Amino acid sequence: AMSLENVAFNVVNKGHFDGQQGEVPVSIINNTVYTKVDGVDVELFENKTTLPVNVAFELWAKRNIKPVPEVKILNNLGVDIAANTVIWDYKRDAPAHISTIGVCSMTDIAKKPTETICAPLTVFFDGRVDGQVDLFRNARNGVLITEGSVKGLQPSVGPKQASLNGVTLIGEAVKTQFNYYKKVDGVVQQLPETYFTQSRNLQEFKPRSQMEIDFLELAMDEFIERYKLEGYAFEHIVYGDFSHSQLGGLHLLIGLAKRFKESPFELEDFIPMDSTVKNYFITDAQTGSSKCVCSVIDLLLDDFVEIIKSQDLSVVSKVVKVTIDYTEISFMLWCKDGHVETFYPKLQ
Amino acid sequence: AMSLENVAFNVVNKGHFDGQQGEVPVSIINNTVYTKVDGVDVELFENKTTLPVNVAFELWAKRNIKPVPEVKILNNLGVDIAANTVIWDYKRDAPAHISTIGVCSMTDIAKKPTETICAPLTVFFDGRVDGQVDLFRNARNGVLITEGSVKGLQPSVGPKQASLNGVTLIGEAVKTQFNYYKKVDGVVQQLPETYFTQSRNLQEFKPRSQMEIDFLELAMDEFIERYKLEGYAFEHIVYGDFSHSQLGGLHLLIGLAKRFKESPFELEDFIPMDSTVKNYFITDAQTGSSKCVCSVIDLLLDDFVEIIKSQDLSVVSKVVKVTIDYTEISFMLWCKDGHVETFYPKLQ
Amino acid sequence: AMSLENVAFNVVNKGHFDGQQGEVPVSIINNTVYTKVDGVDVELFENKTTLPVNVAFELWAKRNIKPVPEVKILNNLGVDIAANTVIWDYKRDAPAHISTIGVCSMTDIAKKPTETICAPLTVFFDGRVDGQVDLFRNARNGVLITEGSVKGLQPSVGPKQASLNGVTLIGEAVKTQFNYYKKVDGVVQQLPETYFTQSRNLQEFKPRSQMEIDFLELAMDEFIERYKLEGYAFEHIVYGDFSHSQLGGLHLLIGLAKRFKESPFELEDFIPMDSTVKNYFITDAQTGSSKCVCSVIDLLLDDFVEIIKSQDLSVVSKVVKVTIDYTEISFMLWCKDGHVETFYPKLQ
Amino acid sequence: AMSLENVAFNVVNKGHFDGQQGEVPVSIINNTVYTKVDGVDVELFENKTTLPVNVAFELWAKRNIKPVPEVKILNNLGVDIAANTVIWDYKRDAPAHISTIGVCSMTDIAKKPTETICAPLTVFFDGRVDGQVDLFRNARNGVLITEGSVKGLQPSVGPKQASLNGVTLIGEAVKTQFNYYKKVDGVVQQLPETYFTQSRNLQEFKPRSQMEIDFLELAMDEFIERYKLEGYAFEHIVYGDFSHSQLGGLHLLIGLAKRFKESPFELEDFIPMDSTVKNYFITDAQTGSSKCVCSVIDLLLDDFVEIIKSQDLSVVSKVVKVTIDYTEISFMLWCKDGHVETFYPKLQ
Amino acid sequence: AMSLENVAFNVVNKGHFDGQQGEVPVSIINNTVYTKVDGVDVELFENKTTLPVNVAFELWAKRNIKPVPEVKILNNLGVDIAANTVIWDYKRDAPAHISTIGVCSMTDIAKKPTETICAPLTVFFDGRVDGQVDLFRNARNGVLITEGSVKGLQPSVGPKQASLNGVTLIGEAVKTQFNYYKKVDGVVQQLPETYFTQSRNLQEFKPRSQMEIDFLELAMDEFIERYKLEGYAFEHIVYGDFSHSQLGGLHLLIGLAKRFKESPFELEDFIPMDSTVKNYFITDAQTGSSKCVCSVIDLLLDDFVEIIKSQDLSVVSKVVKVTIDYTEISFMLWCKDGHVETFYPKLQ
Ligand SMILES: Cc1cn([C@H]2C[C@H](O)[C@@H](CS)O2)c(=O)[nH]c1=O
Ligand SMILES: Cc1cn([C@H]2C[C@H](O)[C@@H](CS)O2)c(=O)[nH]c1=O
Ligand SMILES: Cc1cn([C@H]2C[C@H](O)[C@@H](CS)O2)c(=O)[nH]c1=O
Ligand SMILES: Cc1cn([C@H]2C[C@H](O)[C@@H](CS)O2)c(=O)[nH]c1=O
Ligand SMILES: Cc1cn([C@H]2C[C@H](O)[C@@H](CS)O2)c(=O)[nH]c1=O
């Protein structure tokens, strides 16, 4: 017996939709949901989605509040819809998927993922919910996450981190590292060998290896010397060149974090969505060096060093394909005289 | 257990709110309420009110569907709020009153008119609803309508017509003529002797007396001759003078209806609400004669003739006060040499 | 190379989208599309849909401008989407279907109806477009209209009328009567024997048989006498009973048209969409007789007489199912002593 | 001392802006202006313009309420702005011009038309306002209307009709026929000899000559015979050909009015603004004959007969230029063997 | 061949409009532009301007991405429009100028600044764009910036800083100090001697002289002693007096920055736009001392000391005019017994 007033009751009393009975008076004005408290209107939700306001409010109240895979992982695995949950995309302030299954009458394409409409879609299944491992076993197309083994299914160890209420973290009190499984047309896939992005912020960047600690503490020349990185253009690619009007390199988040400690810069996120590679229009405040499309990836510095050191450096320009977050990332590799000139996630 | 989805269920299945259980999926976009039918959105309500869309939808669904007093009558009697009903104003496409009692959680100031918040307000009571005559006797301020006698209460016979779902009519299958009662400060008030406006339209105007039939069929000079109206300026007041740039007189609806048969005209209703006297910005299409503020009243021609023939014509200018629809309407009477020059509902 | 400015160029120069090259400056403000003419903004389109304004403008410009089946027929046949066209619903001022195929990048689920996403959906195909009969033979689910024979496919003769730019008409200069074909799960389905609604308006109702001419010209008792309709409750069902507060019967459009000639009435279309049976909240202006849910069907009076005269009248109450517009319409038949008491399209 | 509350006071009390002192409480919600009456909100203005609601409300209240040239005439004369008035376009529900002079602080480019910003613009001047003839003599660019002679200025007799509060009429109580004067680059320009469109509606079309009365009363063949119009393709051009899917000819409003008497048709005004030639997407209801772009002009039938009879008919196709409403209207003349095939206001 | 879909393609792929061919599907909902990515809507732009959303999106995509003069400088120089660029005002989130030249079809008044409409306007010209120095030489009214000498034109050295993508900076990798030139009615002006505001932020304030370093490091009494500022009321004007309910002085940004290090305060920017002098409604959090209109200017402390030390201190109150950012700034100077009481940028 779903209703706007019941969703609002749940938000006010339970912090989110919790299946509780009850109703609170609500008013809708433009794209905002309000409720009366002490005789005055209090805002419960402002719609930032392209869905109708009451519909978006319901999907947001029904968002998954357990650690879930980051949207970039789900997107890279081709997930179309989730089974009986809403994966809320905190970067877009919107549902990660267009439709739902057993969530909301306005967006539901089905009540159960066993309905024929779901068979062609890659349905996200959560092994932490009773019966969902079995539903995945019977599903034509799907992606499954579990905390442990599934009998007979060979797992893919996912990233250490997961998103919990829009906070990306490596769980200590909760498990965030999932086993991943994928079926395409009834066939359990062998998920590829993959690197994972680290999903760190610039403001609270923390190193996750001795190499990363050395990159942040050491000066450019002594780090490159210590790790034998001469000829790999880390001065351009990772540290960044701020000497010309066009900002040189700066494609690894760790390099942006090191620069951020010294001086600030503007990062215009012109396509604001979670993705393995992010594109920013960057303006360095200290120098005025800028770049319209600066592709940035947050790889563990050791993983980036392994990738660059594993390439043939004898060609002027070529595409280097690296599986990151289960997707194929194209990088452009530019070399001269057996040394790297630049290496960056391809802007295509 | 009120809800948007339950109000929508009632509208879809019962044509209005009928206390039925059930829910339909709804989407709100901007100021319109939609429901899904055959996979597509169908409009159930467009909010033309200053209330939030969902609140206005509920009051509209809960509108009174019995013949009720026309809003102009309620306004003239000082009605502030209705007891456990919504008087919908079909001319404003909005509730006739700001607040409610026992109707909707967002607009309710009380659940019952016996609550102390209602005591200072003139509450509308309907004797056709069980217990409402008793609530009127206990109310400090109120207006009561009944179909018959109330023991000990002196009645006022109201207009023949009432509004049924926005159609003003003299009931044949239903009763539309009510007894009216009013209380101010716990004391029943004597309602004055009053004329009533006829509530006719220009497009479908029908005469309601032999004098009115003669006005529409006869030529100006022979009507005035037949009814001995020489010296009462009906040529200006009722027929209208279209010979100058400023349209002369034309203050009785019957005169506008007679003119409308010959040639059309524009009537700008610049304050669009039901009132005993209406003000229009009129432009005559045939002549180009116009008037920014042309006060128009729809009185039965016999009643208007009785009013004008009952005035002293020996003063240049004076205010003539006539009780119409329970309100005192001020008219400006201009005379010269014992004859009327003009007589019009006095502009403010 | 689709664009808002190109769609606007087509609307301004061709009256609709006509595949022409060119661009006009456009401004979007709120839900309206404007273009500059003589230095000022001129409205090209007001969005009444739940789609984004620019998306709705494109689908509207790309609406089918040939005579097409009325939306009620498509809905009754289970049509979900149209192949490479937009069926515009002129009663809802919106696209008849949520998604498109080869029409607009924002609403397209596919470019061609042969894509696997279309297989589960009932795709509308138009034999007047080259290759669409072949696409229907290859489609798993679909509805096809043609002007002539399709080799081996058994046809269903559709209604005489079709909608041309929102005008329902029986074509004289164009063909409006189509052959209909339908497929479910890759199998051609036999369309049932059906009556067709006449799609007439109350304001411009025209009789289409000698019986219908006699119903409108003759008095109630002599019509019933002439057509031997004694005992079939036409007095209640067709003519309508306006003697009580609840309006009795009045379920055939021809009866509403006969009443409309004598006196007016309000018809609240509370679910405004094209359907075989319409539900209205009716208020008779002459009497004040009203009904919240008055189901009305526009059948040719001869067809309604054939239906009612073909029923067993020996049971108190039973459901009578009649195929009308390809859908099964349930009617409630109430009898007493071998005579009809009431017969109406059964309310849900 | 202009203000929103003062404009609203003027609208409520004077029917429009009348320079009166006073204020009324107003509320703005979305694009509508409301005022409180009897404790509830009453709509004073709904903004249909691309200006801010409060700005549009002020220009609308300050609209010219005297008979003014129809917007199509002003547009054809190149008018950009009006001197100290607002020409309201009643077909667009918006100001005819983007900017103002001495009207409203938000839209004013100047307080007086003598300011240098006005010199390049064609300013509309009204000889009925004191000092405006002098302002026209001092203006570099302008259009002047007067009721009589201006010493030394050669006049152009304008159309008989003018627009008074959105009603196009030939004044009887007011003057609607003006003398027109125009200046370009400080030099008075000779206005060309011109025909004038009649500005009639389809619903209330009235003939204005014996030829027009004969066209509406007589049958096609006897009218063409009486007026010796054999060989001028009036059967196609004026009467219209409804025998094929594409509606033939039908370019004179009088022909559409004659057809309208027999059967109705849909006229989609896809660029809704006043213009000498109008383009409609027409659908004939009787036949289903339709045309995406049907150019229609309302010329007096005698004027159209004079135009067509004054052309050389010995060429297959040529452009015929006719001055109508001061603008040069291009017509496409198609002939064969010394007879007209078609003649229509040439589509762009 | 400009279009919404092409502007969106450029934003998505190039970070801004870069003249690239291509189209992306877009949806417009209310004042926001979205594009489809991975089946879901991603926000590209939210309109904060008074222009139509699609128009503002285009001007924002076409903003100048080179270091440009800060809007306060352009405003102070009387710039009305820019030649073939958009100066985006990052403080108003809107275009700095109402109209454009060769930028966007909806806002363009001309395609080239040589068109007669541009001659009266002060057109901004950029010597870094080929041909713009020459266009300025031929322009009646304009402001020109260059990086070096223009033959024959005497330059005005502008501020050290410029705005690069909304970041005000003193360029190291790019040039931000321009030569300024101005023509008024075809005559090259002698730009006045001027101070420049420093355009610093409170959060990241950095001293730009030894005096400024001493002001931030030293205690009030020893700074005033070191720089011989006794009698100039720096205790009130620069340091600020927080001992009474009305906050005393505090008109130099450096003083606000020194206070900000110790304790925070609210600065309400009630007219949010770039200006030489800013007015704030300030509330000191530590003391509760507040001021509705606290004028603040960011001058180099040495420049402010030079200004105050160059005034006659023998009058109670007078206006002191100082050219700052090319505009005349009025300051109120209050003295008593040959000493300053207060000196502040005049609130007029
Ligand atoms: C309260 C509120 C939340 N949201 C979204 C933003 C975050 O993605 C997330 C936070 S729980 O939900 C809105 O969009 N509007 C709101 O008002
Ligand atoms: C359907 C509908 C109705 N109304 C109001 C208008 C009339 O006053 C009355 C008619 S039942 O209710 C709206 O305001 N919007 C609507 O959509
Ligand atoms: C001009 C226009 C049309 N439409 C819809 C209404 C009709 O169903 C149909 C008529 S062509 O198109 C709108 O919705 N808004 C418009 O402005
Ligand atoms: C009352 C009102 C008027 N207008 C415009 C429409 C007509 O062109 C004209 C009629 S006076 O003024 C609006 O736009 N909104 C309104 O509410
Ligand atoms: C993405 C975006 C930008 N803008 C404006 C803000 C800044 O002035 C500037 C930042 S590049 O552009 C908006 O107004 N809305 C937006 O969504």
Side-chain angles (χ1 to χ4, degrees), chain D residues 21-96:
Chain D
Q21 275 186 29
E23 285 83 16
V24 305
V26 152
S27 59
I28 294 178
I29 178 163
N30 283 338
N31 241 353
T32 308
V33 183
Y34 299 87
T35 196
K36 221 52 142 222
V37 189
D38 299 328
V40 293
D41 293 320
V42 177
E43 178 175 331
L44 298 186
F45 175 81
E46 201 220 307
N47 183 27
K48 307 297 298 186
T49 82
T50 59
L51 299 167
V53 52
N54 68 301
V55 171
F57 172 66
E58 181 167 343
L59 301 195
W60 171 71
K62 291 171 178 178
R63 70 190 179 282
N64 198 307
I65 62 153
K66 301 188 299 197
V68 285
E70 290 195 87
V71 173
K72 67 183 164 181
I73 299 297
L74 297 175
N75 288 349
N76 290 351
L77 290 174
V79 169
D80 293 314
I81 193 163
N84 303 70
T85 192
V86 170
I87 301 302
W88 189 259
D89 185 328
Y90 284 77
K91 295 180 173 71
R92 288 199 303 120
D93 306 327

Side-chain angles (χ1 to χ4, degrees), chain B residues 232-268:
Chain B
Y232 293 103
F234 264 42
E235 303 99 311
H236 176 87
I237 303 159
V238 187
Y239 289 92
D241 182 349
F242 305 87
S243 64
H244 325 104
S245 61
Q246 177 156 298
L247 207 155
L250 200 74
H251 303 287
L252 265 306
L253 192 67
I254 198 173
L256 276 88
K258 188 186 174 66
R259 176 71 178 179
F260 183 66
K261 284 302 112 226
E262 269 66 38
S263 53
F265 48 82
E266 165 79 5
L267 282 186
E268 183 64 28

Side-chain angles (χ1 to χ4, degrees), chain B residues 43-48 60 63 88-90 93, chain C residues 268:
Chain B
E43 178 175 331
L44 298 186
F45 175 81
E46 201 220 307
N47 183 27
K48 307 297 298 186
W60 171 71
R63 70 190 179 282
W88 189 259
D89 185 328
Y90 284 77
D93 306 327
Chain C
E268 183 64 28

Side-chain angles (χ1 to χ4, degrees), chain D residues 136-205:
Chain D
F136 169 79
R137 296 183 177 282
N138 289 309
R140 182 163 170 93
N141 294 283
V143 164
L144 172 69
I145 62 156
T146 67
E147 293 182 320
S149 309
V150 178
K151 60 184 179 283
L153 300 190
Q154 315 308 292
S156 180
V157 176
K160 279 195 239 59
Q161 77 273 25
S163 174
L164 173 62
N165 309 312
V167 183
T168 296
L169 54 95
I170 297 176
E172 303 187 353
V174 290
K175 184 171 214 79
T176 57
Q177 188 155 47
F178 310 118
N179 275 335
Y180 278 80
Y181 315 86
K182 175 177 169 64
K183 280 174 76 168
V184 174
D185 309 326
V187 178
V188 171
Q189 267 203 347
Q190 172 72 21
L191 285 171
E193 287 313 290
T194 188
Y195 288 103
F196 289 118
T197 57
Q198 302 289 317
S199 311
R200 292 170 291 196
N201 304 104
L202 218 49
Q203 311 268 334
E204 47 199 69
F205 192 95

